[PDB]
Amino acid sequence: MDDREIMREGSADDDMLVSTTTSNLLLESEQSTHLEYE
């Protein structure tokens, strides 16, 4: 003769990889620049 109890819900799952931190790779260095004759 008791009332009804509410059933707790077990929700659930995205599992997104994210991890966008990255190592901020070093940009290509300058890497910039014949005059030999008698």
Binding site: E5, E9, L17, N24
Partner: protein, 1480 residues
């Protein structure tokens, strides 16, 4: 006399000639003294005497500089005296010539001091004055030969000065300071005199004189430039170039362009470096003016200089100099010449590796104002300049300044180009121009589509977008690339060299086109483009580009599956490397790429040892870590090759090489694959920005980035495909789904339908693995729509074997079609439609070889090789192998088809031909073969001591399974590994107890092992960027940490090593279900009891015979769960409670059935073993007597364990044990056992003993802990026994404070009523919780993720009393990245439940908590109601927190099960994961 002086001079000349050989000029020196006596005063005579002293010195050749200096000083004094006096006799000139000849002989010494140089300068100045006086005389002008000879001698003199100054400069160290610093003044003087002399000379004489003078001035400037006194080097070089340029155009017609190029080059270089740019640019203008009447190829270098000075001026902050162009300075030049110069400035600006948007925009604007539109040539030139404008506006926002979009500019350019009627000569240039316009139309339309996608994502922050691909654009846009390729093929395939202005642009555009083809998943057309690039590079003699193109061809050919053609192109690439400078970064990069390609070829050709050596050398090379984007891409390819080598079984490589490879940082292929993806994403961030891959910079288009952008996009899609396939094959469907979704988002952003279809098919397979038929069918229907959209029961399976359609000509589309058929067959077989599934599988079986043949023919047609590829390319072999595996399993279901039986042998032959590349499928087929040979008591009964109350077939089955096990054990798929291990454990039995125990242990929680290995790699990388326990745990969980040997010796040694680390007092029981049909649930239970200092005990319980079998128990559990879900819908309270009470009674009967009808007498294998000596003596006595009764495998440990629980062994259990172990004389055994139990009555069960339960993904569902025998024992669950060892390792280093010290009851965080749904729960726990000392939490509000993270990392106890497990507040991935210190009491529905989807292993957040290091995890196995779980929570909290310090949590977990009204529906729900935990 009038001719006496001439006679004396002639005699002295003959004397000097003799002195050159015989030194006869000594008697002639005496004769000269006699002449000076006869002629008292004669300047010619004194000069002759000085020249005689110099001739003596030249006979000495080289001597002290003092003598030469004195002789030259005397000569200078004599010359000054003669010239000052009015005596310009030719005899003085003859004496000076003799002295100069003597010095030239002395010039062979090539040794002169600064003083010697100055003295020679003074002598040369006197001689020059005399020569000028002689030229002033009318005699020189009267005879042209006389003037010519006078000039010849004059320039010969300064030429000697040149040689002297030039040699003096070389023979000088850094110490030489003022030496050249002063020599430079006289250098300016000589230049001035030489230029002054050039006046008057005309014709060939003039051309020669400017030539020579320029030659020596260049020689002196070269040396002066080297001295770093640029200021001095300029001062000398100014007037010559000023004269050479400001003259009227055409005055100097034949002076060589390069000879002028040198002098101007030196000045501009000096002008540039000295830091003043302005007159450097003006010098470039003067340089162009000097060469104005000539071809443009010479003007190319002056143009490059202009850009260098201007780029440096822009860098140095100057903006006024940045603005000025050549139009603002070269006014007056014929527009044609001006336009060609502007084209060269644009090209030099493109060469720059910086940001040059406005600079190019300004040039394009001036070019467009300059070209007259009305003329046809003007329209064609305007079209070209509009293509340039299209590029600039395609990657920069100048639309407000120009009032035109890139698309409109390029479309107008195309309209202008299609109206061009060209001359027969300029047809090739039109071809190249149209190809560039079409390529850049494609690029700009693609960029606009990308920006639309980015804005679309930024607005609505996607299966609708997948079908939202406009077909019109797909065909029309792709046609642009096909037409550009046709034009370039026409231009380049001809024998004659193309008659185009810039073949360098053609090569760059071809690289961009090849990158685009590889992105649009059209690789054969990329192969054609790369063959054209090699033709262009060979014409340009650019060995770097030829080598790079050959390397790309080899890579693409290996990806397509052809090793022999790749080998041909690899040797072609190797040959070009020899023509390259070895100190250049390009050479190193291409050599390392070639070594990587040889390593891959050796891998494909089964030369694994050589390939491993090469790969190791590449990995250990210090140059690989250079910070450049090409080096990053090389590292990506290196990582993919590492993954390829890690997928090989252990027998292919020796132990030492395996350790050497794994020591580089990656142990499993997926780890290496994930790192390649991360590196690719970092490259994408460097090239562009995060917008292409995320939702929220400037792109530097210096040509290199252009091709690299598309290359990296193609490579990230390829790496994602590899990762998805590998992870799905393993069984990690969630991570594979995540990668697939990311890739699909990228492909929808870029609007590529082929790659979209590929990833949709992969997603469909992943959803099929989860038994989600609805979403799988949705994905497959999307695939079908995309395939019908790209092609212009499906129609592509009706195509002819030799078909030339879009689907059949493209290997990618053919693979997608076959994969779609495979997934559709799987769906039909999972829906119970056997026939249609089998027919679809047969379609796949037929299709794969036909597709291989078509690709073979297409490859031969593209590459024009006479011999066909040795073997058909191997890219569809995995699809064929999977089809064979599925058909063999289906034949297992139907043992009476007689064709599917032959399919097993066909598949085994196919896979055995391709060892070791198809090993997982070989293992699956071998397992199916073993099952066929197996198909009651079954053959396992002879190998097991307890039967329930080579040559032999079993030996052959064991050998086959051993081969399969060693084929997959290095990187095992979860389901196949579990099946193989448990089948081998059944076969081995008690013949090898240790091998059986190892096999049972290895079969549980393999996916968790893979995930832990990946997480450990991430943590080690994080630590290294910013570890001994981590290394030990990685070695513990590794798959390759085995010695060499035959099965199962190294595995047994590793197991015994693991057995030695078991903590004392811990009993490990592994319960596993033996499955004799993949996809089903077995009725055989494998139980292994692992203890310290005790041999492992294993028992098989066949439950299929009993009416209550394991499958029945699982079905009843699922029925109870379903009814519980259905009962909550009821609104009548009384009926609701009646249903709840019935469900509780069903649960109680289920638990009783577990203990009584699944385990039976063996329940004692789960119970602790006594330390009292009675049971051991009893077992020792009983072993012999029972061996006489018929015990096949007498085990003292088993008897001791069973006899240690003699106080509760019922006569039914004793009868079962006796009648099972001893089947020949059962009653004698029963009598002995009964007597032993009688003498063992009154034993004390050990107190400090703990049980760890390792269950199967199916057996984990059941409430084992609530069995009547286990209600008084401390029981927890662990994913695996290696997790117990990892817990011990962590505990040694003090990384688990709760397991080392205890739980501080004041360090607690609670989340109560987070969603404000459960009001009864809050009122009951709010005050009690808030009133506790040091307790902090969130009531009525959603906790922030930082709050939950601090709860888990900083507190010792975490209590969640809301809905579910709170996976929304902190998802499993966040929990993984933390260190779990707290005890997680998650009171919610299905909190500790693992979701079993299909044949995949259970998944849940409890696993993430355990891998994060949680000491203990308490949660519910199924769904509960709020009030009764509140009663359980209150009882547990009161009992544990009120017990006092040093109170075990598990004791009050067990005691609190009596609190709920529903004892077996609510009280049986809570289970504990981890290790026992007490209070501080």
């Amino acid at each position: 006399s009038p001719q006496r002086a001439l006679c004396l001079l002639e005699l002295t000349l003959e004397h000097c000639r003799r002195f050159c050989w015989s030194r006869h000029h000594d008697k002639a020196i005496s004769a000269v003294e006699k002449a000076h006596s006869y002629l008292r005063n004669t300047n010619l005579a004194p000069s002759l005497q000085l020249c005689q002293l110099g001739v003596k010195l030249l006979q000495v050749g080289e001597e002290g500089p003092q003598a030469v200096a004195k002789l030259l000083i005397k000569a200078s004094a004599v010359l000054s005296k003669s010239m000052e006096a009015p005596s310009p006799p030719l005899r003085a000139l003859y004496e000076s010539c003799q002295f100069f000849l003597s010095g030239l002989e002395r010039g062979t010494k090539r040794r002169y001091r600064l003083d010697a140089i100055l003295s020679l300068f003074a002598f040369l100045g006197g001689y020059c004055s005399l020569l000028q006086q002689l030229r002033d005389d009318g005699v020189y002008g009267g005879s042209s030969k006389q003037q010519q000879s006078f000039l010849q001698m004059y320039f010969q003199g300064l030429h000697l000065y040149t040689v002297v100054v030039y040699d003096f400069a070389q023979g000088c160290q850094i110490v030489d300071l003022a030496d050249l610093t002063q020599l430079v003044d006289s250098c300016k003087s000589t230049v001035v005199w030489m230029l002054e002399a050039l006046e008057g000379l005309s014709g060939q004489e003039l051309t020669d004189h400017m030539g020579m003078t320029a030659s020596y001035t260049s020689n002196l400037a070269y040396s002066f430039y080297s001295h770093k006194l640029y200021a001095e080097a300029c001062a000398i070089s100014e007037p010559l170039c000023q004269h050479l340029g400001l003259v009227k155009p055409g005055t100097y017609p034949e002076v060589p362009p390069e000879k002028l190029h040198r002098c101007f080059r030196l000045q501009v270089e000096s002008l540039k470096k000295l830091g003043k740019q302005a007159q450097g640019c003006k010098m470039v203008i003067l340089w162009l003016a000097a060469l104005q009447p000539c071809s443009p190829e010479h003007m190319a270098e002056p143009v490059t200089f202009w850009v260098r000075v201007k780029m440096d001026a822009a860098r140095a902050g100057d903006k006024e100099l940045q603005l000025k162009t050549l139009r603002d300075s070269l006014s007056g030049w014929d527009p044609e010449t001006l336009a060609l110069l502007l084209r060269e400035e644009l090209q030099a600006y493109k060469a720059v590796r910086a940001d040059t948007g406005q600079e190019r925009f300004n040039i394009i604007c001036d070019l467009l104002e300059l070209s007259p539109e009305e003329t046809p040539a003007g329209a064609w030139a305007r079209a070209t300049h509009l293509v340039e404008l299209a590029q600039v506006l395609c990657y920069h926002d100048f639309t407000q300044q120009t009032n035109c979009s890139a698309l409109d500019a390029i479309r107008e350019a195309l309209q202008l180009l299609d109206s061009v009627r060209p001359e027969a000569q300029a047809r090739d240039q039109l071809l190249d121009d149209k190809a560039q316009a079409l390529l850049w139309l494609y690029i700009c339309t693609l960029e606009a589509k990308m920006q639309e996608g980015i804005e679309r994502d930024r607005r609505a922050q996607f299966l609708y977008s997948n079908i939202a691909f406009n077909l019109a654009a797909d065909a029309a846009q792709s046609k642009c690339l096909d037409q550009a390729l046709a034009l370039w093929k026409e231009l380049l395939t001809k024998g004659q060299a193309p008659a185009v202005r810039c073949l360098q642009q053609t090569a760059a555009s071809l690289q961009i086109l090849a990158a685009l083809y590889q992105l649009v998943a059209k690789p054969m057309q990329a192969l054609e483009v790369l063959l054209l690039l090699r033709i262009v590079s060979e014409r340009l003699k650019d060995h770097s580009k030829a080598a790079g193109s050959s390397c790309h061809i080899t890579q693409l050919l290996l990806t397509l599956g052809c090793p022999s053609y790749a080998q041909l192109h690899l040797e072609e690439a190797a040959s070009s490397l020899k023509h390259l400078d070895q100190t250049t970064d390009t050479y190193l990069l291409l050599s390392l790429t070639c070594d990587l390609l040889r390593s891959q070829l050796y891998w494909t050709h089964q030369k694994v040892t050589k390939g491993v050596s090469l790969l190791l050398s590449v990995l250990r090379d210090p140059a690989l870590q250079k910070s450049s984007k090409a080096w990053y891409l090389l590292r990506v390819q290196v990582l993919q090759l590492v993954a390829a080598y890690l997928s090989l079984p252990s027998n292919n490589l020796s132990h030492s090489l395996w350790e050497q490879l794994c020591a580089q940082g990656w142990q499993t292929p997926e780890i290496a694959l994930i790192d390649s993806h991360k590196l690719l994403r970092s490259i994408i961030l460097l090239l562009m920005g995060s917008d292409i891959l995320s939702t929220q910079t400037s792109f530097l288009d210096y040509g290199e980035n252009l091709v690299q952008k598309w290359q990296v996009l193609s490579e990230v899609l390829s790496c994602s495909e590899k990762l998805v396939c590998h992870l799905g094959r393993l069984g990690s469907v969630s991570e594979a789904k995540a990668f697939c979704l990311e890739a699909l988002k990228l492909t929808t952003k870029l609007q590529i339908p082929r790659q979209c279809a590929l990833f949709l098919v992969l997603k469909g397979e992943l959803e099929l693995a989860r038994n989600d038929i609805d979403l799988c069918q949705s994905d497959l229907q999307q695939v079908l729509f995309l395939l019908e959209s790209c092609t212009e029961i499906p129609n592509f399976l009706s195509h002819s074997p030799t078909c030339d359609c879009s689907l059949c000509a493209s290997p990618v589309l053919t693979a997608v079609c076959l994969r779609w058929v495979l997934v559709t067959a799987g769906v039909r077989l999972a829906m119970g439609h056997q026939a249609q599934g089998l027919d679809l599988l047969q379609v796949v079986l037929k299709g794969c070889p036909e597709a291989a043949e078509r690709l073979t023919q297409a490859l031969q047609a593209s590459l024009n090789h006479k011999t066909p590829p040795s073997l058909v390319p191997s890219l569809l072999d995995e699809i064929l192998a999977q089809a064979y595996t599925l058909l063999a399993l289906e034949g297992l279901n139907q043992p009476s088809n007689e064709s599917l039986q032959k399919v097993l042998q066909s598949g085994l032959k196919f896979v055995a031909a391709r060892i070791p590349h198809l090993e997982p499928w070989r293992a699956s087929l071998l397992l199916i073969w073993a099952l066929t040979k197996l198909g009651t008591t079954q053959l396992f009964a002879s190998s097991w001591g307890w039967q329930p109350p080579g040559l032999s077939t079993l030996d052959s089955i064991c050998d086959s399974l051993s081969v399969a096990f060693r084929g997959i054990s290095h990187c095992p798929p979860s389901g196949l590994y579990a099946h193989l291990c448990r089948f081998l454990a059944l076969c081995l039995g008690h013949r090898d107890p240790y091998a059986t125990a190892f096999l049972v242990t290895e079969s549980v929680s393999i996916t968790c092992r893979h995930q832990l290995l990946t997480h450990l790699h991430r943590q080690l990388s994080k630590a290294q960027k910013h570890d001994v326990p981590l290394a030990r745990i990685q070695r513990l969980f590794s798959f390759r940490a085995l010695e060499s040997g035959h099965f199962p010796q190294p595995e047994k040694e590793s197991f015994q090593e693991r057995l030695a680390l078991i903590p004392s007092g811990v009993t490990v029981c592994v319960l596993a279900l033996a499955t004799l049909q993949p996809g089903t649930v077995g009725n055989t239970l494998l139980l292994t009891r692992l203890e310290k200092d005790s041999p492992p005990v294993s028992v098989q319980i066949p439950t299929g015979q009993n009416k209550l079998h394991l499958r029945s128990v699982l079905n009843e559990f699922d029925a109870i769960q379903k009814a519980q879900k259905e009962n909550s819908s009821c609104t009548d309270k009384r009926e609701w409670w009646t249903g709840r009470l019935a469900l509780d009674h069903r649960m109680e009967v289920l638990i009783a059935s577990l203990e009584k009808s699944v385990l039976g007498c063996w329940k004692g294998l789960l119970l602790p073993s006594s330390e009292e000596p009675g049971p051991a003596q009893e077992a020792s006595r009983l072993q012999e007597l029972l061996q006489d009764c018929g015990w096949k495998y007498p085990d003292r440990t088993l008897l001791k364990i069973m006899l240690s629980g003699a106080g509760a062994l019922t006569p039914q259990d004793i009868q079962a044990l006796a009648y099972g172990l001893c089947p020949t004389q059962p009653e004698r055994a029963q009598e002995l056992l009964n007597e032993a139990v009688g003498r063992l009555q009154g034993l004390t069960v050990p107190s400090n003993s703990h049980l760890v339960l390792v269950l199967d993904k199916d057996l984990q569902k059941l409430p084992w802990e609530s069995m009547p025998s286990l209600q008084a024992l401390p029981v927890t669950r662990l994913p695996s026994f290696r997790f117990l060892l990892s817990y011990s390792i962590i505990k040694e280093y003090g990384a688990s404070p709760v397991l080392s010290q205890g739980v501080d009851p004041r360090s607690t965080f609670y989340v109560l009523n987070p969603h404000n749904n459960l009001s009864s729960t809050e009122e009951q726990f709010r005050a009690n919780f808030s009133s506790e000392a040091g307790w902090r939490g969130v009531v009525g509000e959603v906790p922030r993720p930082e709050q939950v993270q601090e709860a888990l990392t900083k507190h010792d106890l975490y209590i969640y009393a809301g809905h579910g497990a709170g996976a929304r507040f902190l998802d499993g991935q966040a929990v993984l990245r933390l260190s779990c210190r707290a005890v997680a009491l998650l009171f919610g529905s299905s909190s500790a439940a693992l979701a079993v989807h299909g044949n995949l292993e259970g998944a849940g957040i409890v696993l993430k908590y355990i891998m994060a290091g949680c000491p203990l995890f308490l949660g519910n196995l199924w769904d509960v109601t709020d009030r009764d779980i509140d009663r359980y929570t209150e009882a547990l909290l009161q009992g544990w927190l009120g017990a006092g310090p040093g109170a075990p949590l598990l004791y009050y977990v067990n005691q609190a099960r009596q609190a709920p009204r529903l004892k077996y529906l609510i009280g049986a729900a809570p289970i504990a994961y981890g290790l026992p935990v007490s209070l501080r």
